[PDB]
DNA sequence: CCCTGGAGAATCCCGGTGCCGAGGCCGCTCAATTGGTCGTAGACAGCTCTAGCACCGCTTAAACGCACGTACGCGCTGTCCCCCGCGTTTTAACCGCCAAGGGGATTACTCCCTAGTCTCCAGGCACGTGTCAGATATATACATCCTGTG
DNA sequence: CACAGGATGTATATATCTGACACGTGCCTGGAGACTAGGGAGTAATCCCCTTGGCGGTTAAAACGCGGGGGACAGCGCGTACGTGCGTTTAAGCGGTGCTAGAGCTGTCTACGACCAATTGAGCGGCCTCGGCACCGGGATTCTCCAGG
């Protein structure tokens, strides 16, 4: 697969920014925020896949994701 | 013969399981030995915290004309109270949204 | 049937009925409360274990839990939690 | 005809999305992105639905907090538009 | 085998104590022993040292670095005495900042054209690194009770030096016990007195002290200066004082030194926070009643006003001194304040105005341990001690600040004591120390 | 009746000292209002750390605060301090 | 007539000098008195070791240096050279304090 | 008889106390049972990390023309290296100083 | 005599002499190295214990230590450390 | 040029629906109950050595106040490009349903690993020792900045 | 506008002093060799849950383009607050009484409470079932915003 990062489209980023509380958005914000999302996801997925490899499983689980998020200090209440 | 059993929660007038807390403490590799009063104290602390959060969330849910407490109500109660915000500063509550906050500069003149 | 699993759901429901007599909760909020109780348990227990390690004591006691709640809970929450725990310990020592 | 001024629709959108509590990124594109990222670390990985949902929740919260800090930086710079420089300053102050 | 002043001295005939001390020092040197000359004020220790140095210079040639360790306040006096009595003897002084000290040492010390060097304690501790290469022949120390104790940087460096001869100048060789006397004796003779020290005491102490000490007491040397007159006054404290005392005894106020809380607490309670009345802070009749000793002092004050003059007040606390100053101000009475916080220029102005022939100066509030060996008060009549320190020798210095050869009439001392307090034990220790020192040295 | 307090200890963190800290941080020009704010920030940080350290000292039944107590407090705060234990 | 440096050369020289040195910058006696006053409120009759005050001074120095760095970054972002309490407050807010 | 005693550290070719590490793991309340390869692995990892840090610190000292390492050299080694900086991104090194860092706008022009 | 305390000073000295033939180290730097080794040991052991508890087991093993190393260390250091620890365990189990 | 009107949105009130919470029943496993026991903490005496508090010198570095002038922060103008709001068309998400298989989850076996003991001894820690690396001082030599002048 | 001179700050050597780091030895306690027993985990095998892949239809959403206002950004001017020097002034820093009792650490001894073990039965968790709450849709009240006079 490729190019799927472009699937995080401009209207979605605008909705997220509006929830954040911004009013005017520059044109170059979208590539920067896509990069930020990519690095965040890479960290989380790296840790989750390592947890799953230790578990000797081929399925990544909500518990693995929560453990990774806790290890990074972003505890997620509501998934186990 | 043997007397009727009484739970340690009943002896302490608690609503949280003292026996379960003691079992988790002993099985959790926290220390070699665990005292009698540590589970009671910890259960009381947990009960107080749960009661505080539930009371604030219930007030929030009642103010919005509901009867079910939902994650939005929980997040409202946590983020509108400073001490609970400090306690849960680095916690994401699933499907909780954000508090209404529009900066005064952005408002129309 | 699935293998049994633990939960604080019944005790959360009891406290909820004590506080708000006729207000219910949903499954998502119950899961959030379960996770919150687990997290507070983990943090307090870890602090107590570190205290016991530092003081070179092999037992976890009410003194350790009191010091842990003072360290972790901020301010008036800590004060009220300490008072509630002392009351519970007094009642347990007296009644038993 | 009729044409709202440039910015009142934005404020209505801000109010509405701050009141709402649902997800904003399309689930199938997010899932495809997650699979593509996991392709590098491991081959033939399967995912539970709750895992993808939790990843989505965490990503949304992280981006929302980052955007709030970016708007604070933009206000500090005597501006209303947010810029990549503001995002980078927020990231640098956070320490990432 | 010197009963008379030699011919090389200028402006001096000596009163035979100088020649006796010089003969004793010469005999000790010939035997190869360094001792302590323990004369206490009025018998010319500086004059004895000057005579010894002039003797060494003029007679069999023994030139070398001559060290004169004196308090910084005495440098000018020692220089004046050196230049006035023996002009042939050549002396220099090392003082100033780093630049001045470096310039002076590079111009004079390294060439070594000098004969005598006069330095202070702090200059010595600073310039030890330069005062090590030279060979030391005779080391003269005034007020030897500065190095009276083992350990400290000054004691270590003074024990570091390689000196052919040593000489100590002090008035009170024994202060608290035998330990400081043994320390000085070890400094004199490190091998002889290596031991750490009525058969095991008293008699052996006298036997040890006889060959290595020689002191002549002013009382038996001057045959003048009529004696003292001490009055002991017992003081009951106010009820608020007693309840504060009880609170301090049993126990949000700082509590670190119970001994020195009860101390000032028996002296004046307003030193504590909150003891004084509210925002008015008006001085009227609550300064007196709230302190029992203050009551007695306030009663004696009109008596001192109506009879005699030149009263001296000694206290050990700056807070008590300032409170007494404020009280004397409220009573619209003249006072003069001298303490360690008062710089030298104002010190001199105050003492000059005080010794002025016809002055209205009534109160001279003098802190006991401020200043060194100076301030020649002779017209003073009444000496009052609000408190007494641990050292009876320090108390003796305080009482002899007014008790001087210029004084012609007997002077009176009034002591105020607080009952049911540790002040009784302090007075007992001071009195036993004074008795021991008198029965050991005075006779 | 003659008393005169000296100063508050927050003023002991002098303007030249705050300037030296700013130089080490890498700033060139400083406003005049920075000093009071920096004093307040220092007070807040010190209060948090000292509260944690006093808690540890009290628990150990000790009346003396220790470097290990300070290190434990900083580790709790998330400010690990190497070089003292 | 007398020689003078332009407004900013001495500042940059000081920046280099204090970024090269390793010693502390605040005064031991005032810092110790401040620590004692702060701890007196939490509990009276407290004794402090010598190493505790030094450790507190080290931690405070590191924290203040990091804070000033972030403050300067914010002030440069605002296209200034002067730092201000606004920059301090923004740095604290973004760091989460 | 018996066999001549040789340490497990020298047995695995290390310079770190495998026996002491094993004792610390067993006494630290981490798990109720500890294996045999775990202390060896942990000692090897600690040895590698110590070698890396000491290598960089010695290089910094030799660049600064000295023959003894000080906390300033340790700080210079920890910073200027991305991976060690990320690992020690929350560690304060006592009397370690700060990296030279002057922004371009503050330079004269 | 006085009491006795434990430190990694001698082993740090051995590694220092190995990696730099003539370069000493002072007291403060040695204390910092002791603290660093203690902190890394604490982090790795805690991560291994949490892994064992998550997977519902009771033995800390080389698999747990390797996973903890991968989760803790950032990348290149992680792979180098894993390789050399695997080498050490291989040497230990080869002929011993 | 505030006041007014049109429109657009937001809001409130009923009415019908779907489902998720709430209650009730069954089995069982984990907590309660006694009883015996062994370390672990409490309690107490002795040492001792460091931390207090109120003065008293003495020295030197760092603060403190000050005047001047100069960059710098701050406000105002004006251009202009970029972002916003709206209508349209294309795209793909979203929602149901279906089929197949991989893989998670459980259970039973069995063995090999680790905990626990006991000797035996050597690696490590404390205590005492001595040479050198580093800080400092002082005097050159070098580099940098600032001002005046052709 | 640029160059050249001068003042100041800084880098660089050599010589001294010193106190700490590197080293040796002796003693000790905890690490190592040799043994045992028990139980946790590795392996094999089986069930069924959940993931993946697929299709078809619908409609909300995204992409695209267009027209226009407002906000970013460069520039200009002002007048003020901060940096750079200087002469006083505290106050830190160090070193001394002068006493101290006090708190932390080691050794010894003893009691009590936490653990372990066996037994037993309520307390929970999982399975059902049913009704009130939330939701969706429709229809009819304000409230805001934007031209236009
Ligand atoms: N040359 C002298 N001969 C006799 N008595 C003297 C002499 N000089 C001073 N005195 C007296 O001795 C007292 C203090 O003398 P002091 O300064 O100790 O002498 P020195 O300086 O020689 O030690 C003074 O009050 C003075 O009256």
Residue numbers in the entry:
A (entry chain F): 22 to 101
B (entry chain C), H (entry chain G): 10 to 118
C (entry chain D), I (entry chain H): 27 to 122
D (entry chain E): 38 to 133
E (entry chain W): 166, 255 to 450, 464 to 517, 530 to 721
F (entry chain B): 17 to 101
G (entry chain A): 37 to 133
Show sentences the authors wrote.
Our structures indicate that SNF2H releases DNA in two steps, by the gradual opening of the two lobes and brace helix movements. In group D (guide strand release, 10% of A-D particles), the DNA starts moving back toward the histone octamer surface. Both SNF2H lobes continue their outward movement, away from SHL3 and toward SHL2, but lobe 2 also moves upward and away from lobe 1. Despite the opening of the lobes, density consistent with ADP can still be observed between them. The brace helix continues its outward movement, away from the nucleosome, weakening its interaction with the guide strand and allowing the DNA to move 1–2 Å back toward the surface of the histone octamer. Together, these observations indicate that the opening of two lobes and brace helix movement lead to DNA release from SNF2H. Subsequently, the SNF2H lobes open and partially release the DNA at SHL2 (C to D structures), followed by full separation of the two lobes and complete DNA release (group E).
Here, we use cryo-electron microscopy (cryo-EM) to visualize the continuous motion of nucleosomal DNA induced by human chromatin remodeler SNF2H, an ISWI family member. We merged the datasets from all conditions and performed extensive data analyses to determine 13 unique structures of the active SNF2H bound to the nucleosome. Based on the conformations of DNA at SHL2 and of SNF2H, we clustered our 13 structures into five groups (A to E).
